């Protein structure tokens, strides 16, 4: 229509929106303004209406808000800014309904921003991005945040509302809100972080530092949520992480006092878990933690695996190692929540420091033998089972299993056959646990040793029944002579043959003849240095005990007294120096329970010394044993080296047993490949030992090496 009608419409619409924004629009109608918009938009004159919208909004902002916020910059600055935001939004809602009714067609045709977005942008450009309000708002926000971090209370809800306001003002997301504001904000944050951490490292301890820095971390997160907005996480977390924990990583765990080593010494358990909880969050914190763990463990091992000076008891030494292992397992369980890295590093350290001694399998075997026979300490089966499991766990992180099982077999030879020194049920449990702890090139020989016991007592009862049916003579009254095989049973010495009880001689001859008629082909014999017997003494009739070399000297005393070394060496066909160990068990180094006394009281052995018997009978019963046998657990030097060389030739022969097959089956060598495979086959048994295999793979070329020999080079050798 005419320009007068449209200009009057625009004038009254401007008056109406001014009344809307002036908080005095009670006396106003909405239908009339919606009609104004319809008749203004049907005429295709939206450009002038949008320009007038922009002009009136910006002139309002500059006149009212820019004056009000600047006038009260020091009194309720955030409060008047919040009020201006609320008033602007509550005018913008109705401005939005009207100019959005027109902005439908406007944005479907002119591809411009909507009225609400236009108001947001113009407010950002005119107030929040103002040349003076920016700096004052930044300064007051930073000062209030810093004074809140100091410990004082500020209006955290005001900061919440301001952050939400900047969120809605961004209109895209994290654009304006970040950029400039975030930079000095995070700069002030990192400055504060360093100033607090440098203060906090200068106390003395780390036990209180780690608690206090965890409290600081928690309070940062509390402010992040309540005081600030919803996000503000990733940059704040990253900067506080890098500025506290990454900076303190090198020095907070190596302090002389309240350091990681010290808190591992006394046994602090909350501190270790809390330090894990903090340093598992920082990059490469677990790495330095496990490095310090390994350093401490290696230091402790070198303190314990020291070879200069050997006086440690076997059971005690291994029990200490077991305690350390279980304590570190419990530490990892509570503090490190069973972390893989710490388990791997402790396993590696154990493998590294348990093979530094050739005694470790010896001592572990001694400990298992001591705890296996019969233990009054921890009699119930639960503690025995836990100790057994820890012993097997220690056996896991240990190489060179050959000497371990050789000593285990020797322990079976010693304990198994003494009189009744087994529990009759737990040896199968040990065999089963060993079956699932190493490889299986054995175990069937230990169960084969159990087959020998079974046939032994079946033959015992069958021979007793046969003797009852026959009744040859009175020699075999109470005879228990175990049928023993040479193979499974470990080798004893060169059977130092000794005098055999004259009456029981008939019993042993009868038993041997019974077995030479049982299956006939069995070259039998007696192991003189093994076994035991009971001698009846005679005021009460008590029964003594003898261990495989006592009975001969005892009968030599019983038949005739006033004997000496010449008497026991002359008419008895008696063995070598082992006799002196056999004899000293009765007189030399004896407590006040002596069954044999001599007039020449001296430590050394004489020739013409008279032997007598003293009462010394504290045990007024019919069952007294001598405990000189299996007394020392030191495993002295000569037996050490002979068993070491026995193990050496056993290793060397098993190497051949594998080497022959690893030629006979697979294709031949490329001069450097077969040793890797032969070590792969035998890694579970012992160390690779890359020198002996090299030295003897040319040891069988002379005898039984066929096909293309490995060192063919020029021609198949």
């Amino acid at each position: 229509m005419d320009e007068k009608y449209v200009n009057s419409i625009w004038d009254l619409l401007k008056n109406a929106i001014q009344e809307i924004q002036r908080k005095n629009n009670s006396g106003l109608s909405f239908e009339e303004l919606y009609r104004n918009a319809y008749t203004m938009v049907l005429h295709k004159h939206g450009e002038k209406l949008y320009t007038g919208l922009r002009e009136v909004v910006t002139e309002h902002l500059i006149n009212k808000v820019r004056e009000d916020v600047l006038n009260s910059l020091n009194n309720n600055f955030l409060q008047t800014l919040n009020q201006a935001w609320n008033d602007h939004q509550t005018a913008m809602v109705m401005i939005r309904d009207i100019l959005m009714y027109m902005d439908r067609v406007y944005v479907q045709q002119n591809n411009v921003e909507n009225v609400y977005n236009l108001g947001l942008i113009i407010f950002r450009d005119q107030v929040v991005r103002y040349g003076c309000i920016r700096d004052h708002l930044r300064q007051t926000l930073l000062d209030m945040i810093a004074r809140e971090r100091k410990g004082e209370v500020v209006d955290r809800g005001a900061i919440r509302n301001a952050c939400q306001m900047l969120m809605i003002l961004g209109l895209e997301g994290r654009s304006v809100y970040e950029e400039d504001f975030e930079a000095p904000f995070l700069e002030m944050s990192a400055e504060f972080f360093q100033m607090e951490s440098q203060k906090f490292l200068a106390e003395n301890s780390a036990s209180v530092y780690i608690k206090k820095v965890e409290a600081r971390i928690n309070e940062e997160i509390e402010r992040v949520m309540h005081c600030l907005d919803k996000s503000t996480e990733e940059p704040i977390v990253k900067v506080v992480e890098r500025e506290l924990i990454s900076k303190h990583m090198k020095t907070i765990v190596e302090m002389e006092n309240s350091g990681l080593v010290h808190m591992l010494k006394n046994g602090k358990t909350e501190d270790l878990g809390c330090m894990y909880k903090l340093f598992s969050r920082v990059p490469n914190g677990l790495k330095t933690m496990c490095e310090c763990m390994s350093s401490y463990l290696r230091e402790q091992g070198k303190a314990l695996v020291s070879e200069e000076g050997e006086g440690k008891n076997p059971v005690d030494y291994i029990q200490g190692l077991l305690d350390l292992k279980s304590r570190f397992d419990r530490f990892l369980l509570e503090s490190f929540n069973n972390d893989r890295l710490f388990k791997q590093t402790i396993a590696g350290d154990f493998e590294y420091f348990l093979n530094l001694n050739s005694r470790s399998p010896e001592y572990l075997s001694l400990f298992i033998d001591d705890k296996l026979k019969k233990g009054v300490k921890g009699l119930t089966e639960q503690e025995v089972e836990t100790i057994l499991d820890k012993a097997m766990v220690l056996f896991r992180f240990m190489q060179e299993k050959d000497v371990f099982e050789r000593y285990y077999k020797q322990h079976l030879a010693r304990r198994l056959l003494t009189n009744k020194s087994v529990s009759d049920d737990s040896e199968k449990n040990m065999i089963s646990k060993l079956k699932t702890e190493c490889g299986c090139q054995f175990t069937s020989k230990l169960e084969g040793m159990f087959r020998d016991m079974s046939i032994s007592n079946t033959t015992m009862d069958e021979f007793r029944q046969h003797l009852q049916a026959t009744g040859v003579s009175l020699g075999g009254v109470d005879l228990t002579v175990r049928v023993l095989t040479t193979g499974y049973w470990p080798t004893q010495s060169a059977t130092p043959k000794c005098n055999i009880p004259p009456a029981p001689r008939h019993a042993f001859e009868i038993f041997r003849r019974f077995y030479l008629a049982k299956h006939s082909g069995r070259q039998l014999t007696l192991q003189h240095h093994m076994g035991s017997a009971d001698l009846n003494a005679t005021t009460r009739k008590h029964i003594l005990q003898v261990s495989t070399f006592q009975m001969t000297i005892l009968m030599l005393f019983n038949n005739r007294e006033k004997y000496t070394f010449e008497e026991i060496q002359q008419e008895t066909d008696i063995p070598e120096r082992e006799l002196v160990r056999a004899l000293q068990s009765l007189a030399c180094g004896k407590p006040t329970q002596r069954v044999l006394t001599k007039e020449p009281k001296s430590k050394e052995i004489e020739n013409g010394h008279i032997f007598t018997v003293n009462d010394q009978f504290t045990s007024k019963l019919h069952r007294v044993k001598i405990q000189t046998v299996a007394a020392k657990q030191g495993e002295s030097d000569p037996e050490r080296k002979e068993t070491r060389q026995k193990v050496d030739d056993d290793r060397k022969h098993e190497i051949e047993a594998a080497i022959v097959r690893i030629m006979k089956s697979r294709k031949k060598m490329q001069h450097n490949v077969l040793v890797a495979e032969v070590t792969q086959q035998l890694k579970a048994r012992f160390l690779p030992s890359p020198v002996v295999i090299k030295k003897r793979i040319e040891g069988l070329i002379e005898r039984e090496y066929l096909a293309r020999t490995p060192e063919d080079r020029k021609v198949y050798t």
Binding site: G157, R661, K664, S665, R666, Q681
Partner: protein, 1150 residues
Amino acid sequence: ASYHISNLLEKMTSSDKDFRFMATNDLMTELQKDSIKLDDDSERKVVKMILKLLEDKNGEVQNLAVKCLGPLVSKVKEYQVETIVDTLCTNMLSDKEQLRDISSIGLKTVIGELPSALAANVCKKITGRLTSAIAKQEDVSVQLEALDIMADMLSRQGGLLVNFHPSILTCLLPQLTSPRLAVRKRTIIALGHLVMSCFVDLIEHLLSELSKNDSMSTTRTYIQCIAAISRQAGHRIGEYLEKIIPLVVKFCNVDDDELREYCIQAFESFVRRCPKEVYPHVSTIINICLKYLTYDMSWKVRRAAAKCLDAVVSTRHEMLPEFYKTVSPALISRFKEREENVKADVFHAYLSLLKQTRPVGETPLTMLQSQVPNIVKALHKQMKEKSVKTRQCCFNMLTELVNVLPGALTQHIPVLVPGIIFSLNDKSSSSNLKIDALSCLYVILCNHSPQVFHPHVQALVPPVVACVGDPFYKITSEALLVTQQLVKVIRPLDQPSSFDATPYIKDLFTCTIKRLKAADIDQEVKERAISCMGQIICNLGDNLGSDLPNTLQIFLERLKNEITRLTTVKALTLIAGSPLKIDLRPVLGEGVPILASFLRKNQRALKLGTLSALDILIKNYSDSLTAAMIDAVLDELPPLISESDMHVSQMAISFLTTLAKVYPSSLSKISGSILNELIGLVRSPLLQGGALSAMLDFFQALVVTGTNNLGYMDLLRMLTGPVYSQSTALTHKQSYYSIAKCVAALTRACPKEGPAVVGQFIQDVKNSRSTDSIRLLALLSLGEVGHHIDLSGQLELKSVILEAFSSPSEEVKSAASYALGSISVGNLPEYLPFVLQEITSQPKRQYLLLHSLKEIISSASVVGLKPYVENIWALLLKHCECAEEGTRNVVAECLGKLTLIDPETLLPRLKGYLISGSSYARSSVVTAVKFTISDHPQPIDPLLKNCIGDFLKTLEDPDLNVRRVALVTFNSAAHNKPSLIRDLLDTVLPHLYNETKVRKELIREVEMGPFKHTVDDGLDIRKAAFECMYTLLDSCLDRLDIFEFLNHVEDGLKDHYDIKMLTFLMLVRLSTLCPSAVLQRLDRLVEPLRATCTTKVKANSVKQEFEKQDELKRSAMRAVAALLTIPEAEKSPLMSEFQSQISSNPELAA
């Protein structure tokens, strides 16, 4: 390849053991990668050969065949797995000794290599065969293996087999009465492995079963069975435990040797539960069991009883006093001995009780000192015993005893010193007994006072010399520590001493030199010996002979190591600054260069140690310094001092300070290099407290002494110049403050003042081309120097001050206010009337000099203020005008700071003005008492406590304007000091809840009649009230009333947006703090947030309001997640419907 499989089959058949072994190894390797060529047909023969290899011959082939079965099971199909499972089952169920155990080992690898749907039908068949295998028929070995693999299947497969669980129940329950004693234990393990597997009905069933079964049946293994099943149940068996408790105490009543087992039940049942009445019952039973020694197999009973005592104490910390008093002295002290083990774990129980009397009416210290006497008699009596474990345990008890009580056995030192001498001698028993004895001696020596020690130390020396001479190095190190403590005990270099020590110094010095000059022992003993000899020299060097130079050169020689460096540096710090001065000229001459070299090791501890050693040498000795080594160290510092380490920087600065008053040439060397470096350092914004004071001293001393062309004139131009050329602030904020304080310290160093003050005057008044940075610097330094050096006349103070005050930059105005505030203190009679007159004169200077007056009161003296303070408070009361609320705030701060000094007389007038003042007056007084709150304890606590309590209880129900003010004050008080509110909390609740709810009188439904705006005018108080509720649960929770709190966080959930979010956070925290106290109203709180997560918005709105509502909904969903974070105790209200819109919220929130 298929050909490879053919070849290995052929070898196995031929029966060649080498070929069989290598074929099996090749089979394992090829199956491990990806089962190369294993078709249905080829699979039918490989499993046949694998089973045959399992059954036939040499054990080497057998284990490799078991290994192949592993990869096979994993890389084979459903039929073949089932087949091999059935075959292993039949092998173990039939005869043939070997087949049984090898098949049992194989079946373990089956359930180990197969975890799921594939293994479900697989394990079903295994369970089916095992159920028939565990029949009641006597097949002892067969059931042994069967229960083994049975508990195995439960242990590794627990997430499945839920259907077969009743079937294994019906065949496992009647297996607990078999005569053979091992299968009963295996069945207990089976039921434990069965109860781990989360099947509820089952456990209730078997519990009712054993309940009905308690009918006089002769069986103890079933008692230990229920013991172990309770052990494995963990934290769900509280009610069933309450059920069995009468049964177990009744079964323990009858005299039997298995009191050990029933006490195992009792202690386990109690150790894994946190009750409120079960401990008495358990304690009663084991006190009986510990008294149970009559005359054997009765030791295990007492062992169990002592373990139970340990558990009891370590767990019920809140019940300590009465139980401690009534059981521990009598029982533990009287039975502080038996044979080997019950004695030992009785000591272990007392060790846990010692750690419970450690917070580190009748306080723990009182009952501890009550325990002490009988304890010392008992441990001495134990010392009479010969066993090594006994003495070691007594040593540990003694160590812990003095760790929980400083004085502990002060009167008993004469009693237990002979025991220590005895344990430090022959008859072997060294092991760890020597280590324990030496550690106990060290603790006893260090913790108490030498006053009771010198006699029994003079009676103590020879044995510790013997332990030092002991070949073992651990005992040597412990003895070295003991000698160090003893020498600290014979000397007292701090408190007066009279005890003569010459022969003991002789002997101790002899053993220390013998141990020290080894160079062949471990690092620990080396460090201990070095520290001990350093202490030897430091304490007892005045009676020492001619061995001092030899030992000192030995210290030099041993210093040059990689491990001994830190200990030697510490000993060098200790040897210096000693009452008994030690000639250290050769050391200085050869160590200052080596310490300078030590500086460049990037080792923080080493840096600090060598810095302190150099400082202390230059401090006391200050005699053998020449140019060479001082030049070396002064060249060494500049790399050391840096922004990355302010504490090391502080130590280096302090070394510079002391050296400044020692070497004249060093001052010039420092001038050059250190002045360059510290000029670089000053501009850093982290200069504070420690380092600030240090640098201030550095400049003070450097300027007051002679320096290379460096003083006032020179340095002042080299301080202002940088910032003047900087012009546009290139720093951030703190460089100006640091430079101003440095200039102030420099000015007060030499009082030839008047040039510099006039120059700063010109700079502040020369408006032409003077940067705001220049202005800031000038004003700040001016105020800082006026602080101490009364600027007094010096041209025009007033003019310059007001000129800088009227600045267009707010920072310049703040600097001017701070400068005036600092000026007034020092010349108060002249400058303070100025402040009053101008505050009462101008209305803008009113506010600005009110800030300056706050500064004035904060940084003034404490003696020359009283009449001035009275005038200040008179003006402050008169100047309560409401032009701006900021003026009200600053005047309130000034009133509070005035109250801090002489509160006694001024406070009652403040309360009276509260009572009789106007609304703005009440706001002023309550804000003043708000900021009267400190952050740390002050001697104002009682009066301020009572009076701020009166303030808050009187000013929490006034007008809405004054209401929110008192609310924010109470918020501040609650956050800062919980210890001044106390009873006020109960009186605050009603007043706070009055405004906590919505007020339907202030909405006014106005300013838009037709258009319906709801302006609240009460949201300010509501936000403040809910902020107080946040700080309430944050500081004081134990005595806070919960029910009303939860009702009105519900009403807050019915409130507006900001209160909605605040209540969401409140709910999250409160549900976390007190879970059970939130479960009562979890459903009640669920109603509001459910209505919140259903409210929709019309399409008429704009997408920004949509993001707002999405934020609200996400906060509500986080609140729901927090309410679900309670340990699953409700599973009730509506259970989170899945819809197209809401379901996105938890997806994006997880």
